[PDB]
Design a protein around this ligand. Sequence first.
Ligand SMILES: CCN(CC)c1ccc2c(C)c(CCNC(=O)NCc3cccnc3)c(=O)oc2c1
Lengths: 215, 215
Amino acid sequence: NFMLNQPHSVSESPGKTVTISCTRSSGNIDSNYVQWYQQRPGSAPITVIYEDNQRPSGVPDRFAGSIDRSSNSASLTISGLKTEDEADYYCQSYDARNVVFGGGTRLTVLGQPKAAPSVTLFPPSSEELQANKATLVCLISDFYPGAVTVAWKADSSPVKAGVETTTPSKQSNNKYAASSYLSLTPEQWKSHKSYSCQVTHEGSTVEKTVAPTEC
Amino acid sequence: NFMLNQPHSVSESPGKTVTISCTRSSGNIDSNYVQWYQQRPGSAPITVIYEDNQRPSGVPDRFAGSIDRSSNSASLTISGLKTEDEADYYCQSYDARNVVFGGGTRLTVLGQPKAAPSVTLFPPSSEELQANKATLVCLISDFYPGAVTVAWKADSSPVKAGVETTTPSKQSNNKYAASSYLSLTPEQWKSHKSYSCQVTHEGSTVEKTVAPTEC
Ligand SMILES: CCN(CC)c1ccc2c(C)c(CCNC(=O)NCc3cccnc3)c(=O)oc2c1
């Protein structure tokens, strides 16, 4: 029985080097190989290091593994830190009685550039109108930081019912996406001239407008 | 290197028994040790099984590993389900040439009644087309448990490139919502007879399709 101790969190700025340590509680670090895994929001982990210092193919050469016998530890060193490196990192070794994981280190990359959202408003599809539904969707993507406010309008008037906005989640570009959907009946959709989605990010507002088709 | 195929999700109420299968694509399951890792949401991984059926210290006997040579599969069975069992489970093996991980199974210990998603597929909006964008949105709402997998087809062929799926978030009705979007160019959109969004939830798969029209 041994455990692997790693910091719960570390922070660093783009282009700088960050190190994550993983201390083995009992026995020598060098007696068993160490793996490192990266995990991003909402996805399975990938392997970034195995056998202490080997990178699988696909893994940026900015990732380096090492062992320090005299602090009985393993380290993951990420140089030229990119925004995309923001993730959880787990160290892993073996007890022959077990596969042992460290507790995970959340790596925060500070000072990531602000990014205004792309907003696309979709009117109701034919299929859903045929099933007596007129849900509108406002796709909001590629924004940072991951907080927005969404308001809807029926013509010029504020919409007070039937809005849902998803919790922004980080996508592969390390920027956020959400959808806001307004669950109208067909009669509400066709009784108005238009509906608008209004997205405010970092005190900037984007408003899109859709209207019942001439079809 | 072979694949390990696991179901996307499983769910049961507390005190029930659930089994998670992991099928080896080629070679013999018994050629190589199968490990099972548990990852509770927001936690580090933990080994629950190694060497097909060995439980590490502290893993209760409610967890059982097995092999079926005839089906070339490994199974993890969890009896007397507890809420702390809610986790992703991954099987793992090797052929020396490399470590192979299964894709993970989400195990929900049911906290509320199951709810099949409403799935709505939106074709490109006029305004985004004028911006040379043919992004499609697949809106997925009112579902429980909060685990879905989304696959996109161009005609009949799977699409990988350009797919982003948001992490499911709990809406005002205590059910989950998510969206998947496929960043097409108008070129790609118009060059196919149709695009489909396939949503899998609890082993039911629904598929919506949209096709370029005009008016
Ligand atoms: C939770 C138990 N662990 C140990 C930390 C897991 C569990 C699973 C894996 C898998 C699947 C792979 C193989 C590569 N990973 C992978 O493809 N993950 C999904 C993904 C896909 C594309 C981009 N980012 C993530 C992998 O390399 O490592 C894994 C580690």
